[PDB]
Write a protein that binds this ligand. Structure first.
Ligand SMILES: [Mg+2]
Ligand SMILES: [Mg+2]
Ligand code: NA
Ligand code: NA
Length: 137
RNA sequence: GUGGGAUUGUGAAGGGAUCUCGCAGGUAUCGUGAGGGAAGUAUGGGGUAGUACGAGAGGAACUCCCAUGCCGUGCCUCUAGUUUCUGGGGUU
């Protein structure tokens, strides 16, 4: 797909990462973490923090990492979350950590490698991440 | 008419008289539905299609069908939270 709007292409996933969450960066661009600024395709409700889950594209800034990647608004895709979600086949699953990868607004991954497993939901929404994943889980 | 009560405050006991009230409904279901309230609402993807239009750059929509926000009404199989079952352990 690699299209910014993903909600109508993937099933319900429990929201894990509200605005202000800091998640690890799984790529090798040089960034260490990502600061969730907002979530693509989020429709607001009064007082509700925009919250990301797997496969979502987020706006982010880099808080720790090499200087050229910092002090900017970047795009990123969530690939792991600690909050558990229920898959349609009934299985409840979660990751040990939260992680994301830096992308351009059209879904192309900056960086050429991914550390750790990628959720199947995220990989189905984004083929480039899927090809770079060392395991789809 | 029948019954039961009662008259105004200065004893007692019997007589009337006059009022007032009751005299037919209880109890248990299934329904009607006047009137009132009132609620669903959006986005995306597939396909149409890279085609109609267009020199070209670019570039649509509906039958359909697949999701997802929000809102609403519930529920507790699962997963999560909660424990004064102070349940069972452990430990100062
Ligand atoms: Mg507020
Ligand atoms: Mg319980
Ligand atoms: Na009515
Ligand atoms: Na439990």
């Amino acid at each position: 797909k690699d299209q910014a709007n993903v909600k109508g292409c993937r099933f319900r996933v429990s929201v894990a990462l509200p605005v202000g969450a800091v998640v690890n960066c799984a790529d090798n661009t040089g960034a260490k973490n990502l600061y969730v600024i907002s979530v693509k395709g989020y429709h607001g409700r009064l007082n509700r923090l925009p919250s990301a889950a797997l496969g979502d594209m987020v706006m982010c800034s880099v808080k720790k990492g090499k200087p050229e990647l910092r002090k900017k608004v970047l795009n990123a895709v969530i690939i792991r979350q600690r909050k558990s979600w229920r898959r349609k086949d009934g299985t409840v699953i979660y990751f040990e950590d939260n992680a994301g990868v830096i992308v351009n607004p059209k879904g192309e991954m900056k960086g050429s490698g991914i550390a750790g497993p990628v959720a199947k939901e995220s990989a189905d929404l984004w083929p480039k991440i899927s090809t770079h994943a060392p395991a789809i889980v």
